[PDB]
Amino acid sequence: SVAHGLAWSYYIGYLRLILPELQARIRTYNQHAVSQRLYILLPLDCGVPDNLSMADPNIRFLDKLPQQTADRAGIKDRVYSNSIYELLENGQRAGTCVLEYATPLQTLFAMSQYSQAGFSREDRLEQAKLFCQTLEDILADASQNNCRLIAYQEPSSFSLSQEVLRHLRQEE
Amino acid sequence: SVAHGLAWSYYIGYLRLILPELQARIRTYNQHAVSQRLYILLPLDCGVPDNLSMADPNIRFLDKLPQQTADRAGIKDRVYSNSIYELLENGQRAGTCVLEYATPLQTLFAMSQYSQAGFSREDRLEQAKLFCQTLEDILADASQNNCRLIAYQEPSSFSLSQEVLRHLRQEE
C-alpha cells in the first residue's frame, strides 16, 4: 500500500530520471575505473544512516559523480547528486561503485514512529519486503541495466562491504 | 493508500528536510523582497509541467535560491534546489515567492498510465484530493509556518498566477 506506492514513486520520481543519464556521467568521471550501474542498498531493517562509512568503514567515500540537473516541476536545474565509494577487503581496494541507500526505506522507518501515519512499527519488515519486490518487478520491465538492487537482512557480525562486493563481482 | 503514503513520504523525505533551512536561505537571498514560505502547487488534475512559465506566462522565473546541501542516505552533499518566481498582474510585479509543484502529483499521473501499477486512470482525482488533505493534516501538526499549500481544480480560462497571488495577499 505504502510500500507499493513508495516503490512506484521512487521509480517514477527519481530512478526514471537519473538512470538514463547515469552511464554518461560515469564515462565522464572515468575519462577525466568506477563500475557502471547505480548500486542501491535495500536494508530490510529500514536502517538508513546518512553516512555509509559509519555503516561499514570498508565502504570509503571517493568522490561525487558530476551532478545531473533538470528542470523539474518548477524547480529550475533541480540537482541530482550521487557518490562514488571504494569497497575495501583486507586493506585492499576491491571495487569502485556509485552507491546509495533507497531513501523510501527511511520513510517507512520514520512513518512507523509517527502516530498520525497509521503505520504500526511491527509492519516495517513486511512493507520493506513489499517495497523491494515491487521495485524489482518495476525494474525487470523497465533502467534495469543501469542499476543493481542489494536487498539484505542483518543478523551480530555483518559486513555491508562484502554484501556489495558479492553483487559487484557477479557483474565480472 | 498510494496518496496517503505519498503525502507521508513527501513530508518525511523532502519537506521535513528543507523547510527548517528555508527561512535562512530566503533571508540570505534578500540581504544580498522574496516572500517567506515555500508555495506548493497542488493541481488536482495532477498536471505537473516542468516549466511554470508555460502553465502561466504571468509566473516568471527570477532566480534560484542559494542551494541547500546535506548528506543524505550515502549521497554526500545531496542538493536541494528551489526557484524564485515573480507573479505578474496586468503587466505589474505583484509578488515574489519560492514556488514549485508537489512532485508526488506527477507520480500519481504517471502511475495511472502504467498497467503494472494497478492504478486506474479514473482514480486520479480521488487520490490527488487524499494527497492534499493528508499533507494538510501532516503540516497542521508539524513546517506549517514555512510553507503554503495551493490546491486548485481547473475548469476554460484559469489564471494560475491569480491563484498564487490570492494566497500571497492573504499573508499580508
Ligand SMILES: COc1cc(CCCc2cc3sc(C(=O)CCC(=O)O)cc3cc2OC)c2cc(C(=O)CCC(=O)O)sc2c1
Ligand atoms: C516524487 O516522488 C519521489 C519519491 C522519492 C522516494 C523517497 C520519498 C520522497 C523523496 C522525495 S525528494 C523530493 C524532491 O527532491 C522534490 C523534487 C523532486 O521530486 O525531484 C520529493 C520526494 C518525495 C518523496 O516521496 C513521495 C524520491 C526520492 C528522490 C531522491 O532525490 C533520492 C534522494 C533523496 O531521497 O533525497 S526524488 C523522489 C521523488
